[PDB]
């Protein structure tokens, strides 16, 4: 009911596999919910079809 103010905060991280050498950077982003307690690797989006 507060629209944007009821949307969950997202914790964003940059994962940077390098392989300990050179600038070969396997880079990808990870997102987590700010209040994750169980399954921080999952963002449960509840969809009413």
């Amino acid at each position: 009911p507060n629209e944007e103010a009821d949307y969950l905060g997202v914790r964003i991280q940059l994962r940077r596999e390098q392989g300990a050498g050179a600038t070969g950077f396997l880079e990808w982003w990870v997102i987590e919910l700010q209040e994750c307690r169980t399954d921080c690797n999952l963002l449960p989006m509840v969809i009413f079809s």
Partner: protein, 97 residues
């Protein structure tokens, strides 16, 4: 598989969470447990970030030194089964901070 339909327990748990909001309960009561799905979106990006080194250097300059607002756009897009009916395969929208 990541798309999990609501169990009767998950529907009772959602109803409980929203029992204080009569407008939320009026909305929840319009949908069946089969109509509500949890998409368990994995929090690791399913693609490597292919950003060009000059695009990354520009993004870094725009984050530190950019005077204009940089729009963080979160988008969702739902593909549906046209063989189950309806005229629209893709339902999508965007949030923009």
């Amino acid at each position: 598989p990541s798309i999990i339909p609501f169990t009767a327990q998950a529907y009772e748990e959602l109803s409980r969470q929203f029992d204080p909001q009569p407008l939320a309960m009026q909305f929840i009561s319009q949908y069946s447990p089969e109509d509500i799905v949890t998409a368990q979106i994995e929090g690791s990006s399913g693609a490597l970030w292919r950003i060009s080194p000059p695009s990354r250097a520009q993004m870094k300059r725009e984050l530190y030194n950019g005077t204009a607002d940089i729009t963080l756009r979160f988008t969702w897009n739902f593909q549906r089964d046209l063989a189950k009916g309806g005229t629209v395969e893709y339902a999508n929208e965007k949030h923009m901070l």
